Write a protein that holds these residues in place. Structure first.
Motif, short mmCIF file in Angstrom:
data_model
loop_
_atom_site.label_atom_id
_atom_site.label_comp_id
_atom_site.label_asym_id
_atom_site.label_seq_id
_atom_site.Cartn_x
_atom_site.Cartn_y
_atom_site.Cartn_z
N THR B 7 40.43 67.93 41.91
CA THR B 7 41.66 67.27 41.49
C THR B 7 42.87 68.19 41.73
O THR B 7 42.74 69.42 41.73
CB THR B 7 41.62 66.89 40.00
OG1 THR B 7 41.62 68.09 39.23
CG2 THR B 7 40.36 66.10 39.66
N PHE B 13 48.72 60.41 39.33
CA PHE B 13 47.99 60.58 38.08
C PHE B 13 47.85 62.03 37.71
O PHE B 13 47.75 62.88 38.60
CB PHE B 13 46.62 59.91 38.15
CG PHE B 13 46.67 58.42 38.01
CD1 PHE B 13 47.45 57.82 36.97
CD2 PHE B 13 45.97 57.60 38.89
CE1 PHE B 13 47.52 56.43 36.84
CE2 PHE B 13 46.02 56.20 38.78
CZ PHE B 13 46.79 55.61 37.75
N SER B 14 47.84 62.29 36.41
CA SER B 14 47.68 63.65 35.89
C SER B 14 46.30 64.24 36.20
O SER B 14 45.36 63.51 36.61
CB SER B 14 47.94 63.66 34.38
OG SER B 14 46.89 63.03 33.68
N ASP B 16 44.25 65.46 33.94
CA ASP B 16 43.35 64.89 32.95
C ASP B 16 42.86 63.49 33.36
O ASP B 16 41.69 63.17 33.19
CB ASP B 16 44.01 64.86 31.57
CG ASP B 16 43.86 66.17 30.82
OD1 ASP B 16 43.78 67.23 31.47
OD2 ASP B 16 43.81 66.15 29.58
N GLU B 17 43.75 62.68 33.91
CA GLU B 17 43.38 61.33 34.27
C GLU B 17 42.44 61.31 35.47
O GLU B 17 41.48 60.54 35.49
CB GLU B 17 44.62 60.45 34.49
CG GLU B 17 44.30 59.03 34.97
CD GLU B 17 43.72 58.12 33.88
OE1 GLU B 17 43.74 58.49 32.68
OE2 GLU B 17 43.24 57.02 34.24
N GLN B 18 42.72 62.16 36.46
CA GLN B 18 41.85 62.26 37.64
C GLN B 18 40.45 62.67 37.21
O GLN B 18 39.47 62.05 37.64
CB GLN B 18 42.40 63.26 38.65
CG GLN B 18 43.65 62.81 39.39
CD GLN B 18 44.23 63.93 40.23
OE1 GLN B 18 43.54 64.48 41.09
NE2 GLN B 18 45.50 64.29 39.98
N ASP B 20 39.04 62.39 34.24
CA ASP B 20 38.48 61.29 33.49
C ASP B 20 37.95 60.15 34.37
O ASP B 20 36.82 59.71 34.17
CB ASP B 20 39.55 60.75 32.56
CG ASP B 20 38.98 59.99 31.40
OD1 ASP B 20 38.48 60.64 30.44
OD2 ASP B 20 39.06 58.74 31.44
N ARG B 21 38.75 59.67 35.33
CA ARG B 21 38.30 58.56 36.18
C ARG B 21 37.08 58.93 37.00
O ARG B 21 36.19 58.11 37.19
CB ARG B 21 39.42 58.04 37.10
CG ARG B 21 40.41 57.16 36.36
CD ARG B 21 41.57 56.68 37.22
NE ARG B 21 42.59 56.02 36.39
CZ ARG B 21 43.29 54.95 36.77
NH1 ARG B 21 43.09 54.40 37.96
NH2 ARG B 21 44.20 54.42 35.95
N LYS B 24 33.78 59.47 34.78
CA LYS B 24 33.28 58.14 34.45
C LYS B 24 32.59 57.47 35.65
O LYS B 24 31.56 56.82 35.49
CB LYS B 24 34.40 57.24 33.93
CG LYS B 24 34.91 57.62 32.54
CD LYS B 24 35.59 56.44 31.83
CE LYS B 24 36.96 56.10 32.42
NZ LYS B 24 37.79 55.30 31.46
N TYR B 70 39.92 61.50 43.61
CA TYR B 70 40.41 60.21 43.14
C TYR B 70 41.15 59.44 44.24
O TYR B 70 41.03 58.23 44.34
CB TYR B 70 41.31 60.31 41.89
CG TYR B 70 41.81 58.94 41.53
CD1 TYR B 70 40.90 57.94 41.14
CD2 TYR B 70 43.15 58.59 41.66
CE1 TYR B 70 41.31 56.65 40.85
CE2 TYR B 70 43.58 57.29 41.37
CZ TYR B 70 42.65 56.33 40.97
OH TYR B 70 43.03 55.04 40.67
N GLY C 36 37.34 50.38 34.80
CA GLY C 36 38.26 49.83 33.79
C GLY C 36 38.39 48.30 33.82
O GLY C 36 39.31 47.73 33.21
#
Lengths: 136, 130, 136, 130
Positions: B7, B13-14, B16-18, B20-21, B24, B70, C36
């Motif tokens: 990342t 996107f931040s 943290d968001e990268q 997280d996605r 998951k 991402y 999502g």
């Protein structure tokens, strides 16, 4: 079949050009005639860059497009038509194809009337857009 | 699959968001993340970035067989560098590459073809314009 | 985002299928939820060939397309949707794309909303037409 | 270029016409024809044809560096055989392939890409349908 030939050189010193106007015309004429076609006219820009479309003969060719004088545009090498991918996509897609005019670049063996020539264009356009989005 | 997550944000996107996605996504696919590689506050214009370099140097270790990002432009904002990384560094070392947003997976037939077409077309474009 | 999942098996012996209906649903649901999204419904053809489109759930899916119930169709593997290139081109191009519905095949990482997913389709269609003309 | 001309009709265009169009094309391009390979009265369904075989056997001789046909379907009516010939026989031996009607030239960047795409897509199609 009536065919327009487009030729270009950056300078007016034919002896020193990689492929002079005359060599371009000779190859293109010999080719069109082997194919059984007729050259309806010759567009020649002697001493103009391929970086932009603002060249007298190219402008003439674009203007004459809405006359149905010819149905194919022939170049010896793609870089003679343009040295810009964006300008090339505009010419071939939005000027030639849009008016039902095929385009052949001999050196590259690109012919937009063929299945693989039209697919090449679609691919060039899609990939160019993708690259531009990555870099911008 | 054993995946390395890369990342980046510059100084979208931040981080943290990268992270997280992508965590998951990896877990939903049944994959294991071997490590995260984070370049927080670095340009994608060039490849000289600490976490990117750690990733490239970690290839020899064989702790992962896929690099996951991402969006392609996290990896690089250069077509030439992207091709070097994906073609000459990852693929050359039997490491697959996935960009979630572009749905590009070099282990698939179409991700592999895409990479081949991008390389061939980029070279064609250079040759026209140079 | 609301998403329809399509699953198929040729036989009704789930224990013996390579990927049972339940394995297909589980992966697709887990995927959609990581992304999502929400699964608006499940289309399941248990005991039908992928050789033809005449299957109850597939027919239901095609009929429900003109309801805007969902905007994406998800399959685990392309061969679950169809084992015919012609049927696949029809479904994805003339049924899904035509109605502004994206299509994702997980195993193949094909997503028609992406630049490379839509280009893949254009290429498959062009090449398939070219092959058919060569062989016929 | 030193070109081998391959023409065929089964039991489109006649042999004479194919030979004529292709000789004119070669001469206009400045090429030399090394020989003509004519299968008059043979199916393109399979590769077992006397002139085709003579062509394939003549590869070792190095008397030509290009195979030239009027239309791809003269070479073969099989995608699989076409790919074998062009990819595994001509290209493998540094022999270029030109199909005048389809404007396909494997020595060009786009003819070469076309061949790569046709191969990758055909394999994808087989795998879906098998």
């Amino acid at each position: 079949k009536k065919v327009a030939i487009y030729t270009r050189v950056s300078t007016t010193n034919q002896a020193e050009e990689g492929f002079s106007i005359d060599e371009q015309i000779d190859r293109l004429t010999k080719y069109a005639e082997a194919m059984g076609w007729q050259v309806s006219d010759t567009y020649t820009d002697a001493g103009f860059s391929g970086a932009k479309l603002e060249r007298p003969a190219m402008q003439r060719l674009i203007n004459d497009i809405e006359n149905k004088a010819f149905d194919t545009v022939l170049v010896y090498k793609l870089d003679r038509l343009s040295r810009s991918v964006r300008d090339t996509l505009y010419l071939v897609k939005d000027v030639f194809t849009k008016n039902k005019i095929d385009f052949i670049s001999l050196n590259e063996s690109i012919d937009t009337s063929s299945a693989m020539g039209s697919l090449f264009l679609t691919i060039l356009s899609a990939i160019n857009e993708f690259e531009r989005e990555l870099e911008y």
